[PDB]
Design a protein around this ligand. Structure first.
Ligand code: NA
Lengths: 122, 122, 122, 122
């Protein structure tokens, strides 16, 4: 599925996820968010199951973006956890956690949760 | 917080998180889980905010493990999203998502959520 | 939105959510899951913001089902947290946590997370 | 566990959860938050597994609060999902989702996630 995963993906918000899957299970690339306090590309890294089950289960993967680049620093980081589902309309189905740096007093509201679905087209 | 983050951490379950924080915002290391379908070390990668706010906010970070190594494949991946809090008893406070690859019929129950707190001692 | 909310809703799995919104902010009804260790109807209760913002924001709400009725006991409970969005195709957009009763040794994997979208038609 | 659950609990933030567990699996009571845009008591309702497993598993439960009372309206709702653990130091261990009413353009950041642990003392 390294072939399957490698490439450019778009989520329902119009964000762009550019990724390369290595044969060793690495994920590397860039992320551009259509929303939030964000501009241009941000480095991402992650991991995926490079020897998935052959029973038509999806392929588990996840990755992280820290929302700091040369343009902006949102003092936050998102991780997406999900699975790649192959076939005619390939999808990465995710849930994500966004944590922003807070004081201890604000720690209770430090983390957003959502869900993003990525496809190969817009 | 490069120095602050780099090192060996343990969570409340007795899992071991060995990480290096690069100056470019990279996290690299290994993870050993005291629980689940897991043995020995697994590669992790992630990102952290390499220029955090100076108002006493934590430092946002996240990382991923795909639960495949030379011993086992759990066909799953966990992402931790959280913040590093410096000082006498330093902490990484996280929330995590564990997605396991499923059929589309089992997709609704593909994801676990939890929270791990990491300290520099057991 | 009392009127808007009250009635029969269906999610993307084919589950059926039958609810009455009281004027005091109460939600009462039954839930039938198309998936999992579930048969027939289960009691639900919840709350909703009975005086929402008038700026086009959704209406916050949540509810709980404990997965025990006269047929089955899954020893678990789901809460849905989300918002009701009015207009031509009304939606309830949710995220949910499902916790199942565990031993302390299995507590780390006690909780599932997902997202359900409910509409007035199947 | 009806007697077990019924009563006053406190979480790690100093919030106060006052609950009655009915024989039919109902949870009714009030919640006061030590944090956020909250004052005084708010109605809660929820459900719990009134016939738990006898193998030393916890008891599943959940409840909702809509953050509207006679003082304030935060246009939001939290659901807690978790389990009651009996014994010398009884605990309710939860994860929670807080959704606030948003426009469709801000839906992606409408939901916070956390974890609260409740005990019988502060
Ligand atoms: Na509820």
């Amino acid at each position: 599925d390294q072939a399957g995963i490698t490439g450019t993906w778009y989520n329902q918000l119009g964000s762009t996820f550019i990724v390369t899957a290595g044969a060793d299970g690495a994920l590397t690339g860039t992320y551009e968010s259509a929303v939030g306090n964000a501009e241009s590309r941000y480095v991402l890294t992650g991991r995926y199951d490079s020897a998935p089950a052959t029973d038509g289960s999806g392929t588990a993967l996840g990755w992280t973006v820290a929302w700091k680049n040369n343009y902006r620093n949102a003092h936050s980081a998102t991780t997406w956890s999900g699975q790649y589902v192959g076939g005619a309309e390939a999808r990465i189905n995710t849930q994500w956690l966004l944590t922003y740096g807070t004081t201890e007093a604000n720690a209770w509201k430090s983390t957003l949760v959502g869900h993003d679905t990525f496809t190969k087209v817009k």
